[PDB]
Write a protein that holds these residues in place. Structure first.
Motif, short mmCIF file in Angstrom:
data_model
loop_
_atom_site.label_atom_id
_atom_site.label_comp_id
_atom_site.label_asym_id
_atom_site.label_seq_id
_atom_site.Cartn_x
_atom_site.Cartn_y
_atom_site.Cartn_z
N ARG A 131 0.84 -1.19 0.00
CA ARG A 131 0.00 0.00 0.00
C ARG A 131 0.88 1.25 0.00
N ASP A 132 0.34 2.31 -0.56
CA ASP A 132 0.94 3.63 -0.48
C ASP A 132 0.56 4.30 0.84
N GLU A 133 1.03 5.53 1.01
CA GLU A 133 0.89 6.19 2.29
C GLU A 133 -0.58 6.41 2.63
N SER A 151 0.62 -0.83 -7.63
CA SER A 151 0.81 -1.64 -8.83
C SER A 151 2.25 -1.53 -9.30
N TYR A 152 2.69 -2.57 -10.00
CA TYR A 152 4.06 -2.67 -10.48
C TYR A 152 4.06 -3.24 -11.89
N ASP A 153 5.17 -3.04 -12.59
CA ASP A 153 5.27 -3.52 -13.96
C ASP A 153 5.86 -4.92 -14.10
N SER A 154 6.41 -5.45 -13.00
CA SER A 154 7.03 -6.77 -13.01
C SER A 154 7.08 -7.31 -11.59
N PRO A 155 7.20 -8.64 -11.42
CA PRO A 155 7.38 -9.19 -10.08
C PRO A 155 8.63 -8.63 -9.40
N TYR A 193 8.99 -6.69 -5.57
CA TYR A 193 9.55 -7.54 -4.53
C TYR A 193 9.81 -6.76 -3.24
N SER A 194 10.59 -5.66 -3.29
CA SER A 194 11.06 -5.02 -2.06
C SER A 194 9.88 -4.57 -1.19
N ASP A 195 8.90 -3.92 -1.82
CA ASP A 195 7.71 -3.47 -1.10
C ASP A 195 6.91 -4.65 -0.58
#
Ligand SMILES: OC[C@H]1O[C@@](CO)(O[C@H]2O[C@H](CO)[C@@H](O)[C@H](O)[C@H]2O)[C@@H](O)[C@@H]1O
Ligand SMILES: OC[C@H]1O[C@@](CO)(O[C@H]2O[C@H](CO)[C@@H](O)[C@H](O)[C@H]2O)[C@@H](O)[C@@H]1O
Ligand SMILES: OC[C@H]1O[C@@](CO)(O[C@H]2O[C@H](CO)[C@@H](O)[C@H](O)[C@H]2O)[C@@H](O)[C@@H]1O
Ligand SMILES: OC[C@H]1O[C@@](CO)(O[C@H]2O[C@H](CO)[C@@H](O)[C@H](O)[C@H]2O)[C@@H](O)[C@@H]1O
Ligand SMILES: OC[C@H]1O[C@@](CO)(O[C@H]2O[C@H](CO)[C@@H](O)[C@H](O)[C@H]2O)[C@@H](O)[C@@H]1O
Ligand SMILES: OC[C@H]1O[C@@](CO)(O[C@H]2O[C@H](CO)[C@@H](O)[C@H](O)[C@H]2O)[C@@H](O)[C@@H]1O
Ligand SMILES: OC[C@H]1O[C@@](CO)(O[C@H]2O[C@H](CO)[C@@H](O)[C@H](O)[C@H]2O)[C@@H](O)[C@@H]1O
Ligand SMILES: OC[C@H]1O[C@@](CO)(O[C@H]2O[C@H](CO)[C@@H](O)[C@H](O)[C@H]2O)[C@@H](O)[C@@H]1O
Ligand SMILES: OC[C@H]1O[C@@](CO)(O[C@H]2O[C@H](CO)[C@@H](O)[C@H](O)[C@H]2O)[C@@H](O)[C@@H]1O
Ligand SMILES: OC[C@H]1O[C@@](CO)(O[C@H]2O[C@H](CO)[C@@H](O)[C@H](O)[C@H]2O)[C@@H](O)[C@@H]1O
Ligand SMILES: OC[C@H]1O[C@@](CO)(O[C@H]2O[C@H](CO)[C@@H](O)[C@H](O)[C@H]2O)[C@@H](O)[C@@H]1O
Ligand SMILES: OC[C@H]1O[C@@](CO)(O[C@H]2O[C@H](CO)[C@@H](O)[C@H](O)[C@H]2O)[C@@H](O)[C@@H]1O
Ligand SMILES: O=N[O-]
Ligand SMILES: O=N[O-]
Ligand SMILES: O=N[O-]
Ligand SMILES: O=N[O-]
Ligand SMILES: O=N[O-]
Ligand SMILES: O=N[O-]
Ligand SMILES: O=N[O-]
Ligand SMILES: O=N[O-]
Ligand SMILES: O=N[O-]
Ligand SMILES: [Cu+2]
Ligand SMILES: [Cu+2]
Ligand SMILES: [Cu+2]
Ligand SMILES: [Cu+2]
Ligand SMILES: [Cu+2]
Ligand SMILES: [Cu+2]
Lengths: 338, 338, 338
Positions: free
Chosen positions: C180-182, C188-192, C196-198
């Motif tokens: 989640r954001d703040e 959403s992301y463009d790739s796995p 990953y880090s989030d």
């Protein structure tokens, strides 16, 4: 008044277990044990994080005690004057007085001697429990171990057949609650007392920062992997004094599992993963069939890989291609594939 | 159409249980019960924190209902017009219509009458379940209890021997999710509806603020400790409608435990700690062997000591020094000790 | 060297199961399966939230594989070059080499062929496990399924009686950890890799954002409810590769339940709610007795109603008023009531 032979046991540090007989023809004895409380800063993870631990005998977990049904267990609990806190001991194996806690509260500089009769078979937790909020705090600071009360005829499969282990290991799992600063870095303290308020705040949110075997992430990996050989029957005793766990031997099974940990109940057979209720010990027998590395985890894999809860077995012997084989090694996907 | 004798049962507030027979020679009856929904602000902890509870019969848990296998259970559920919400009831003991929930939705000012046949033996949860997000909300606001369906021959040990309890207590465990303000203080509201949005946010993070027996921290300690005597066989029914628990009687054991709660299965023997799956009831029989105070906990000790989940038993009788004794009271560690 | 008949199985997408025999008179075979890894963005909830999933065969869970005791299972695992990550497979049913993981690591563009002997009966998890922190990440990104190893005589009740199911469904439960954001909105992301880090940060706090059956909230509700008929015996296989679950069929029971999932153990009878340890599969047989909608949940009702973990059964047939009836429909509370 109690006129039985006495036998002093020298405890050993986990994951190893002091010498004992499985089946015995000896009659009941008074089995004498000594536990010495040690408060000390300990390293708990592979990045060097420390915390203000409290232990029996300098280890997390405390050592495994092994007796037989109908023995009496006479425990001298010592609280050296270098310690800062009162301590006591509760044996889940024992009957009365809060498991012994109500009879064993000792201040630094004192010792006490408790005797309890081993009327109930199985593996059981023991832990410190000084009263009120100090109970969880002492436990999650490391003050817990286990005791095994064997039947005098040793283990059985619940269907009239004897079971005998060639090796026994004791895996104590510890949930830890290490405070963080505003940036997320773990905090350090000069004493357990100074750490308490911040630690209690973490505890209240019920999410450990670390979940470890034998007192630290990586304790039972690398050069401290657990040894076995193909064909050996290995008993793995697992305890968790505060929080559930779900043991799993990666590449193996539990051939005979007492997940509730009590030998008056027949074991379950052929488990993939079993369940140790927080506040209990359980045990699994497995006969190794294949050589190589095995990981032993709690199968919350986040906990296992990212919070510290992985051990290894290194098993010597010959590979059995009937049970498993790599038919074809990695290769480019055929261009003809659809 | 259904031509059986009718018998009205008067329920009593937990942890006590209405009078009943264990073994019976009576044939099937229609056992008539009434449950009245009460929404009310209740005190849940020892600091006076309140929350907007929703209850059956004014208690958390709702009362224990006791019937025998093959009885019919005819429940009048009443939703007084002083309430604000619709309510219903789902019996995990019952077959069909979402346990009854699909046949019992009532608005304030209404009542409904459901009959279900007691075809399955054991202890079972009952709970409100109005639909969608209202299901967890009503449950974790207090709307859950249990029913016990005994075999007509009473309990047995799974090995052909009758088991009879001298006393029965019902321990309902409740996970609560009380909102906090920015400083951490618990928030208060004027109605359940006003509390909902903030409560749901806490619920979503799956970490209770309180875990209590009989509706509040300390409910079954002090002057409300549970009584027993040395030699008495006590049945302890434990329910948790939403979240796992791991009961443990400190200083005792579970002599016979049905942790999944269903009497068609043989009990396990001699447990230290057992496991109540969220959404179920289980039961443990224990014969007290020692006098004194016993704590009955969930053995997540953080929950037990710091979130509210401790009850006491006060047991009268004579101490048995064979089972446990303090061999030597606390004393200075010998100067000669190494 | 291994000279047995070969049989290719075509897998089907969950919750359905490929065709198979229960009892069989065939001897051991080499049962050939193919699994193709697919990384893809998938919708996981009813608001359209997506996440970067990683799957076997394009589904969460991966498909159920069904074989018999003593068969050999020859699995071709394919990692297409459109994928970004290495993958492998660990079968909890298999013996050695970390369940196969140590023999099946493949980069994009590669495939591998593993054979394992089905020596242990039950339902078992299979999952990806590339090493270290990648193990939990791949699993909680969707790379897990189950395999069932039936006895050659089919199921039994542990008391010498055959049990046969008319229908089988496989419910794979997945805990998801969506960043989640703040402001609390899902990211959403463009790739796995980019996710990953989030994702790992969410994983570390051990609280899922979603708990889903068949890969998304609402997957098995509405038009995708599971069908059955009154009188049919339905086997419900339930897996959870990472986290505990407590299945419950609302309005029904588990007539025969193997909660640890292993058919060498007798089932428990008449359960309300059962328990799937994280890292395992279990199974429940139920004979439907009433028509209508049933909800199948994990009985943490917060998870069930608010995080995604509800499925439906739609059961056709005639209502049995002996088992349950609405004696009186909702009506105003009598003015005479006290
Ligand atoms: O400078 C902090 C850095 O040093 C390490 C060294 O191994 O540990 C120190 O700080 C930790 C976090 O406060 C303490 O737990 C530890 O006692 C202290 O030596 C690193 O872990 C840490 O990041
Ligand atoms: O069960 C082991 C051990 O427990 C004792 C009590 O110390 O008996 C308990 O368990 C018995 C068997 O289940 C019950 O019959 C008995 O009432 C209960 O106290 C010992 O007598 C027994 O060896
Ligand atoms: O975890 C939050 C946040 O804290 C930092 C340091 O600011 O790392 C800490 O937490 C990590 C996860 O537990 C540890 O690996 C590390 O030892 C600890 O300092 C950040 O790196 C992390 O983003
Ligand atoms: O004991 C595992 C170890 O043995 C070696 C040979 O020394 O390979 C054996 O084990 C493999 C499975 O892990 C088999 O595939 C192989 O056929 C067998 O010889 C090592 O490669 C391996 O680390
Ligand atoms: O002033 C707040 C203080 O009063 C107490 C009194 O027992 O309770 C009040 O505030 C609580 C927190 O909002 C409420 O839950 C309660 O209804 C109200 O009487 C203390 O608990 C609280 O700290
Ligand atoms: O088992 C108690 C009770 O359940 C019923 C259904 O109301 O039967 C179920 O359980 C039986 C025994 O396991 C199964 O044989 C049967 O198919 C299933 O419906 C009653 O008949 C039984 O008394
Ligand atoms: O817990 C966070 C923080 O909140 C405070 C009040 O600001 O205390 C609250 O939380 C405690 C733990 O749940 C309660 O004992 C108390 O009733 C409640 O107001 C702080 O004291 C605490 O640090
Ligand atoms: O019932 C516990 C209660 O009894 C007393 C004597 O009245 O002591 C008994 O119980 C003790 C264990 O809790 C024994 O060590 C003692 O020998 C026995 O007399 C009280 O001291 C105790 O609270
Ligand atoms: O604008 C955000 C809004 O659009 C939806 C559309 O269904 O989904 C988008 O945003 C989600 C949250 O980042 C993503 O998970 C998804 O990939 C993207 O289509 C809503 O869910 C979201 O609130
Ligand atoms: O139990 C199923 C299957 O397991 C094997 C090993 O592949 O045997 C294991 O379980 C046996 C029965 O419990 C133990 O006696 C044996 O020592 C253990 O390896 C097969 O032999 C058996 O069919
Ligand atoms: O949950 C925190 C907070 O985030 C918001 C958006 O700011 O909603 C998000 O979280 C909800 C709960 O998971 C989701 O239903 C929704 O898809 C998501 O954007 C707030 O509405 C919520 O208060
Ligand atoms: O199958 C449930 C479905 O059947 C109907 C009649 O078509 O009602 C039956 O089921 C009800 C319980 O859900 C009974 O109370 C009723 O007597 C019985 O006819 C529908 O109303 C219901 O959706
Ligand atoms: O470093 N521990 O407080
Ligand atoms: O009293 N123990 O900190
Ligand atoms: O199979 N182990 O994660
Ligand atoms: O005080 N309760 O809303
Ligand atoms: O409909 N119940 O709030
Ligand atoms: O032994 N009880 O925590
Ligand atoms: O939208 N998923 O990254
Ligand atoms: O190596 N797997 O991301
Ligand atoms: O009875 N189901 O929540
Ligand atoms: Cu202590
Ligand atoms: Cu304890
Ligand atoms: Cu309600
Ligand atoms: Cu329910
Ligand atoms: Cu993978
Ligand atoms: Cu695994």
């Amino acid at each position: 008044d109690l006129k039985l032979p006495r036998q002093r046991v020298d405890l050993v540090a986990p994951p190893f277990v002091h010498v004992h007989e499985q089946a015995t023809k000896q009659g009941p004895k008074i089995m004498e044990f000594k536990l010495v409380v040690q408060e000390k800063k300990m390293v708990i993870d592979e990045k060097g994080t420390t915390f203000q631990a409290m232990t029996f005998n300098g280890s997390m977990p405390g050592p495994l005690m092994v007796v037989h049904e109908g023995d009496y267990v006479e425990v001298t609990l010592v609280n050296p004057a270098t310690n800062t806190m009162p301590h006591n001991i509760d044996f889940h194996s024992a009957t009365g007085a809060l498991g012994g806690g109500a009879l064993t509260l000792i201040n630094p500089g004192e010792q006490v001697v408790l005797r309890w009769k081993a009327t109930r078979t199985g593996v059981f937790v023991y832990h410190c429990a000084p009263g009120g909020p100090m109970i969880p705090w002492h436990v999650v600071s490391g003050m817990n171990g286990a005791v095994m009360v064997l039947p005098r005829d040793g283990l059985n499969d619940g269907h009239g057949h004897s079971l005998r282990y060639d090796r026994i290991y004791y895996i104590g799992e510890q949930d830890l609650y290490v405070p963080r600063d505003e940036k997320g870095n773990f905090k350090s303290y000069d004493s357990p007392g100074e750490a308490y308020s911040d630690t209690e705040e973490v505890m209240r949110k019920l999410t450990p920062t670390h979940v470890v075997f034998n007192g630290k992430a990586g304790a039972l990996t690398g050069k401290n992997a657990l040894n076995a050989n193909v064909g050996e029957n290995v008993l793995i005793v697992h305890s968790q004094a505060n929080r559930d766990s779900r043991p799993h031997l990666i590449g193996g099974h539990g051939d005979y599992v007492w997940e509730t940990g009590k030998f008056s109940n027949a074991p379950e057979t052929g488990l993939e993963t079993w369940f140790i209720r927080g506040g209990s010990a359980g045990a699994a027998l497995y006969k190794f069939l294949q050589p190589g590395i095995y990981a032993y985890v709690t199968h919350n894999l986040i906990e296992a890989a990212n919070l510290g809860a992985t051990a290894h077995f290194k098993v010597e012997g010959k590979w059995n291609d009937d049970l498993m084989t790599q038919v074809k090694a990695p290769a480019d996907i055929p261009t003809g594939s659809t």
